[PDB]
Design an enzyme around this catalytic site. Structure first.
Site, PDB file in Angstrom:
ATOM      1  N   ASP A  90      -1.927   5.561  -5.127  1.00 55.23           N
ATOM      2  CA  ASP A  90      -2.188   4.563  -4.093  1.00 55.23           C
ATOM      3  C   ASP A  90      -2.446   3.219  -4.690  1.00 55.23           C
ATOM      4  O   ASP A  90      -3.409   3.072  -5.437  1.00 55.23           O
ATOM      5  CB  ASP A  90      -3.368   4.983  -3.187  1.00 55.23           C
ATOM      6  CG  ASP A  90      -3.567   4.089  -1.981  1.00 55.23           C
ATOM      7  OD1 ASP A  90      -2.584   3.464  -1.536  1.00 55.23           O
ATOM      8  OD2 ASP A  90      -4.710   3.969  -1.521  1.00 55.23           O
ATOM      9  N   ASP A 127       0.799  -1.218   0.000  1.00 52.14           N
ATOM     10  CA  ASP A 127       0.000   0.000   0.000  1.00 52.14           C
ATOM     11  C   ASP A 127       0.831   1.266   0.000  1.00 52.14           C
ATOM     12  O   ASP A 127       1.608   1.473   0.943  1.00 52.14           O
ATOM     13  CB  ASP A 127      -0.936  -0.033   1.208  1.00 52.14           C
ATOM     14  CG  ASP A 127      -2.061   0.962   1.148  1.00 52.14           C
ATOM     15  OD1 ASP A 127      -3.191   0.556   0.804  1.00 52.14           O
ATOM     16  OD2 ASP A 127      -1.827   2.139   1.497  1.00 52.14           O
TER      17      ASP A 127
HETATM   18  O1  LIG Z   1      -5.166   5.556   0.880  1.00 48.83           O
HETATM   19  C1  LIG Z   1      -5.114   4.898   1.920  1.00 48.83           C
HETATM   20  O2  LIG Z   1      -5.379   5.476   3.132  1.00 48.83           O
HETATM   21  C2  LIG Z   1      -5.760   6.835   3.186  1.00 48.83           C
HETATM   22  C3  LIG Z   1      -7.284   6.879   2.830  1.00 48.83           C
HETATM   23  C4  LIG Z   1      -7.795   8.294   3.054  1.00 48.83           C
HETATM   24  S1  LIG Z   1      -7.890   8.647   4.714  1.00 48.83           S
HETATM   25  O3  LIG Z   1      -7.868  10.059   4.843  1.00 48.83           O
HETATM   26  O4  LIG Z   1      -8.990   7.918   5.244  1.00 48.83           O
HETATM   27  C5  LIG Z   1      -6.402   8.080   5.334  1.00 48.83           C
HETATM   28  C6  LIG Z   1      -6.043   8.487   6.669  1.00 48.83           C
HETATM   29  C7  LIG Z   1      -4.821   8.095   7.234  1.00 48.83           C
HETATM   30  C8  LIG Z   1      -3.920   7.321   6.464  1.00 48.83           C
HETATM   31 BR1  LIG Z   1      -2.224   6.824   7.191  1.00 48.83          BR
HETATM   32  C9  LIG Z   1      -4.209   6.911   5.175  1.00 48.83           C
HETATM   33  C10 LIG Z   1      -5.448   7.288   4.604  1.00 48.83           C
HETATM   34  C11 LIG Z   1      -4.722   3.409   2.084  1.00 48.83           C
HETATM   35  C12 LIG Z   1      -5.555   2.702   3.162  1.00 48.83           C
HETATM   36  C13 LIG Z   1      -6.676   1.999   2.373  1.00 48.83           C
HETATM   37  C14 LIG Z   1      -6.391   2.265   0.858  1.00 48.83           C
HETATM   38  N1  LIG Z   1      -4.992   2.740   0.780  1.00 48.83           N
HETATM   39  C15 LIG Z   1      -8.073   2.571   2.745  1.00 48.83           C
HETATM   40  O5  LIG Z   1      -8.470   3.723   2.665  1.00 48.83           O
HETATM   41  N2  LIG Z   1      -8.849   1.527   3.274  1.00 48.83           N
HETATM   42  C16 LIG Z   1      -8.118   0.317   3.273  1.00 48.83           C
HETATM   43  C17 LIG Z   1      -8.547  -0.951   3.667  1.00 48.83           C
HETATM   44  C18 LIG Z   1      -7.634  -2.013   3.518  1.00 48.83           C
HETATM   45  C19 LIG Z   1      -6.328  -1.795   3.041  1.00 48.83           C
HETATM   46  C20 LIG Z   1      -5.892  -0.519   2.628  1.00 48.83           C
HETATM   47  C21 LIG Z   1      -6.805   0.540   2.740  1.00 48.83           C
END
Ligand SMILES: O=C(O[C@H]1CCS(=O)(=O)c2ccc(Br)cc21)[C@H]1C[C@]2(CN1)C(=O)Nc1ccccc12
EC number: 3.4.23.46
Length: 394
Positions: A224, A34
């Site tokens: 991502d 990721d």
């Molecule tokens: O972009 C990302 O994470 C960001 C998303 C926007 S956010 O603003 O929700 C946020 C916040 C803190 C961190 Br560190 C990363 C992220 C990552 C995390 C991601 C996808 N890639 C996901 O959102 N759900 C998931 C569920 C299983 C595995 C990976 C993910």
């Protein structure tokens, strides 16, 4: 770099994972690769979607940091106890590394049924690591502890009772020239937190969306790998769909299709890809005034799904979706290209993949330069809240 070739497996839309081993003796886990997170977090307790998990008790090398971690994404939440152990990527560089590990004890809508991954490998920067930037990410540890050059590249490749298997390659420490054709074009990493880029222009079959470029990067534009879709901001997604619908006007699809909540089917091998337009994302070049385009084919934004009932048909999911956290260049985008995370030089390179899905008429392209005189700043400035203003970094 051959030993690293084909080191990624997975199911369509559930993510690309790399085999890693944690502890002494090494416990083997499948870890989701990721680039939109900075944490190395592994399942450490039973969960219904978890085949196996990290058991700290059986490691002579495990060290407890006596500190907890809580990570909630917009889609998914995980939490656990922080520590350090010996980490190695079997089909990666022949090195063992002392790394921070977040042993997931409780989670919510995080793990995916049949995804075949027991953890996450956050490859982004410290600036987004939790509970703060002092918790050194895996890649940072890998570079400080070894001679491994500060770069990695990803080659993500696409593909009836189970989902379709995906393959790909994670090359740690360099570029593999056999994984791409043509020129490798670079876009600056705006800020070292996420792998942030600036999209300067968008075109659907040559027709410029004609929007203010800041909307393309509102509130951010990130690369991502842990995201399946090309997620665009509300205004951009709306413009894009209006345009895609216009080019594919011959055939009328339901509303549930564009919302990615429904498939569309054509008799095996009779899919009219021609009626679908190309998306060209123009990324800010290394030279100011300069840009290059990454062209994506309907074979990328229309994910195929073989339904058990409609087995005699070729069914597809529209893999472009809405986002409130900005533009996300997920697997849909990445599948067409060899993506280079040149951390050392603070930039992202794209070249045409030696494994992408295409038809006899069109091909995913990386083309440049394209000059634009007196071009405005396309990047957005995230309103600085009192929470972000309070922080101290020494
Ligand atoms: O972009 C990302 O994470 C960001 C998303 C926007 S956010 O603003 O929700 C946020 C916040 C803190 C961190 Br560190 C990363 C992220 C990552 C995390 C991601 C996808 N890639 C996901 O959102 N759900 C998931 C569920 C299983 C595995 C990976 C993910």
């Amino acid at each position: 770099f051959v030993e690293m070739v084909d080191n990624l497996r997975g199911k369509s839309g559930q993510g690309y994972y790399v085999e890693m081993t944690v502890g002494s003796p090494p416990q083997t886990l499948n870890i989701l690769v990721d680039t939109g997170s900075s944490n190395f977090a592994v399942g450490a307790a039973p969960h219904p979607f978890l085949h196996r998990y990290y058991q700290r008790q059986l490691s002579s090398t495990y060290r407890d940091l006596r500190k907890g971690v809580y990570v909630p994404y917009t889609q998914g939440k995980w939490e656990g106890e922080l520590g350090t152990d010996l980490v190695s990527i079997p089909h990666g560089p022949n090195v063992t590394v002392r790394a921070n590990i977040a042993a997931i004890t409780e989670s919510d809508k995080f793990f995916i049924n049949g995804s075949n991954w027991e953890g996450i490998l956050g490859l982004a920067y410290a600036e987004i690591a939790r509970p703060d930037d002092s918790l050194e990410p895996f890649f940072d540890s890998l570079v400080k502890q070894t001679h491994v050059p500060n770069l990695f590249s990803l080659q993500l490749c696409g593909a009836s009772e189970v989902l379709a298997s995906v393959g790909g390659s994670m090359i740690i420490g360099g570029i593999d020239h056999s994984l791409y054709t043509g020129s490798l074009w670079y876009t600056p990493i705006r800020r070292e937190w996420y792998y942030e880029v600036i999209i300067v222009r968008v075109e659907i079959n040559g027709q410029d969306l004609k929007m203010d470029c800041k909307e393309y990067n509102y509130d951010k534009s990130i690369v991502d790998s842990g995201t399946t879709n090309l997620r665009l901001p509300k205004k951009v997604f709306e413009a894009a769909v209006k345009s895609i619908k216009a080019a594919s006007s011959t055939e009328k699809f339901p509303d549930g299709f564009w919302l990615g909540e429904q498939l569309v089917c054509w008799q095996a091998g009779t899919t009219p890809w021609n009626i679908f337009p190309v998306i060209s994302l123009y990324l800010m070049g290394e030279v100011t005034n300069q840009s290059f385009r990454i062209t994506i084919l309907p074979q990328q934004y229309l994910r195929p799904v073989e339904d058990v009932a409609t087995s005699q048909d070729d069914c597809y999911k529209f893999a472009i979706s809405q986002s409130s956290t900005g533009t996300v260049m997920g697997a849909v985008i990445m599948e067409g290209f060899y993506v280079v995370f040149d951390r050392a030089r603070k930039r992202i390179g794209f070249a045409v993949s030696a494994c992408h899905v295409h038809d006899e008429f069109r091909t995913a392209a990386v083309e440049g330069p394209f000059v634009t005189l007196d071009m405005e700043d396309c990047g957005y400035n995230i309103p600085q809240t009192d929470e972000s203003r309070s922080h101290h970094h020494h």
